């Protein structure tokens, strides 16, 4: 009775990423002369050796642009935003509850276009953001500008690190494969007004926060049994799962107070992750028989340059294989959770412009990771797709 | 191959609720003595008219009694909380982060305890608060407490109103049907220390939020293939939906705020409610036939008592229906997404103790019903299992 409606009712192969969009704020923000924009604006132009030590932060991070909401006039507006940890929740809210799902309407509607199906045929909405909290939710706000019917079924996740853009895809799996017919319309959406702050001469964390982040926002469809001829297929996912990382809280994470976000971090960050990989990777590839890190494509959250780094230098892979993070990371900084979605989409673009035979570059098999605050590390197993040209 | 294993790692039948727990911190509140305490510690008792006001609120409210974790200690040790809009969200943030996975830990204990087996079965985690927003989150705090295996599945869901106890038996159903072996922990724990404030003379609104909600915790542990002769289902998940109320956003909701939480009301949220529940009804209870709504069992989120009022006639529900709503609304408070459980836990041991042939009061299909700010209703269709006296 309930086992022949289950059968009836589930879903019969594997789910699949069928689009990918993406969107930024309008705002350039290039970081040479980044020191002279975020100097100017937080009345700190009379501390030269402080704006100096900056400059080289900024050098250092190798980011070379990024898109910010943010932008002068709004800072003047809103003058507590400029602060270093004065009382400006208030101002930061006002922001992020209404831009929060405003960008994260364009990614959708992109990825929806892509798709090239009714809106009518979304089941389901899994949006994720660090910010934006609100009663209704950004996923009530984002369902409604976007028009999806009222009997989408939402959730949304707030102030999971950067890692959760990985993990929506974990969920996404479930809710495809077990409802036959279910689409599924995930979007990741970062804003970082809660985290902008003005300098302070002791701490190196919170201004290193103010070079490295980006905003943005990517979206993708997911579902099981692609119909034929409309629904093409670019990733099968094969699996998903997560670990935690013993006695690793501290590696990095952050607090929300009023002052809006801060961010901590070690020095070991880059470090903890590469060395921390191993379990995750071996439950990930060794049921497929993979013998050699090389062989798999890498869609991989780049958290930072020295991460990357770290993670190449651990697997012994050759620059290809994160090639694609370097880029993103490089042209819009780390966007959080929506990065991995810029990074997915680099990956099957460059795949068929370089007149690739998969959508993983010419490879069968992939791992997309995402990690953070835990330490979390998320590994998702793709299947790349054929490119027929 | 991709369908093969697709066919080899999902369960069989349909997800099942094993076991049940609740929690309450042990502050006692009686209501009738509530607007005593409180015009006292908010030092407020120069406002004898506000009060002669709230305490017909309390009355109206018809609650008798709650559990909090705030006391008059908190309160003086932390005064910022007593201001009715002062900025007090660090105050706040300091409590919710430490005692939201606290009190979650021992409504999940109960359940585990319930469900009879180890702990290092537990695949999947997924933990709804409004409150105690940090990273790493709530989640991996719950998970350090409990002890759970570093592999387990971690989901945290912040800042979703009431509605949410029900819609993670939404997301529990997915995760459980579709892999093989899976069991789900799901939690749900409100802590109101970010919605306590001070009486403002010209805010009834904010006021009326004072007299009703309570403090508590609801776990299960929901797995589909029930191991014969070790675990016994006290309800089948036979669907689960949710749909969206067009142009109600303000019928009911709330801020995120430097003074912390605040929510809002229009007085006739109960006929808003009752009046747009036929559809999700319909839609979940047409495909088995039922004719009545009391061809149906209820465990409905109470909300408040005006609310279970307008159900029920709006239903045209017999008493009976609504009870065990009632019962736990009066002897606990509006818990949140917590409050659902309680009213679950308290219709199968009802069930029991009554001699009723089916854990649902003798009645073989129910409705367990979410609803919160959106205006968002959480249908969950749940099918009774024999009690065997």
């Given at each position: 009775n309930l086992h022949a409606l289950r059968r009836e009712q589930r879903a019969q192969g594997p789910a699949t990423i069928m689009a990918i969009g993406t969107a930024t704020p309008p705002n350039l923000y290039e970081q040479s002369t980044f020191p002279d924009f975020y100097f100017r604006v937080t009345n700190s132009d009379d501390k030269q050796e402080l704006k100096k030590k900056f400059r080289r932060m900024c050098e250092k991070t190798m980011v070379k642009k990024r898109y910010l909401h943010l932008t002068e006039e709004i800072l003047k507006e809103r003058?507590?935003?400029?602060?270093?940890?004065?009382?400006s929740f208030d101002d930061r809210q006002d922001i992020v509850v209404e831009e929060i799902p405003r960008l994260a309407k364009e990614a959708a509607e992109k990825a929806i276009k892509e798709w090239g199906?009714?809106?009518?045929?979304?089941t389901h909405l899994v949006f994720c953001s660090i910010s934006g909290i609100d009663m209704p939710g950004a996923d009530y706000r984002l369902a409604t500008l976007l028009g999806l019917p009222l009997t989408v079924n939402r959730l949304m996740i707030y102030?999971?690190?950067?890692?959760m853009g990985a993990a929506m895809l974990r969920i996404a799996k479930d809710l495809a494969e077990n409802n036959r017919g279910a689409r599924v319309l995930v979007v990741a959406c970062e804003i970082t007004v809660l985290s902008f702050r003005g300098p302070n001469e002791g701490d190196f964390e919170a201004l290193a926060g103010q070079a490295g982040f980006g905003d943005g926002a990517g979206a993708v469809v997911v579902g099981a049994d692609?119909?034929?001829?409309i629904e093409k297929p670019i990733?099968?996912?094969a699996a998903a799962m997560q670990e935690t990382v013993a006695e690793?809280?501290?590696a990095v994470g952050g607090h929300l107070r009023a002052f809006g976000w801060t961010f901590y971090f070690l020095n070991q960050l880059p470090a903890i992750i590469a060395d921390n990989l191993g379990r995750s990777l071996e439950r990930a590839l060794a049921p497929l028989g993979v013998?050699?890190?090389?062989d798999v494509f890498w869609v991989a959250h780049p958290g930072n340059w020295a991460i990357i780094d770290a993670i190449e230098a651990k697997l012994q892979?050759?620059?290809?294989?994160?090639s694609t993070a370097r880029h993103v990371f490089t042209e819009?900084?780390?966007?959080?959770?929506a990065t991995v979605y810029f990074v997915m989409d680099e990956l099957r673009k460059r795949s068929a412009v370089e007149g690739?035979?998969?959508?993983?570059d010419g490879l069968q098999w992939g791992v997309l990771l995402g990690f953070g605050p835990g330490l979390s590390i998320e590994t998702v197993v793709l299947r790349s797709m054929p490119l027929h040209h």
């Open positions: 003058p507590k935003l400029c602060s270093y940890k004065e009382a199906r009714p809106k009518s045929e979304i102030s999971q690190a950067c890692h692609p119909l034929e001829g990733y099968e996912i690793s809280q501290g013998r050699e890190w090389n892979l050759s620059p290809d294989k994160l819009y900084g780390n966007m959080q959770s690739r035979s998969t959508t993983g």
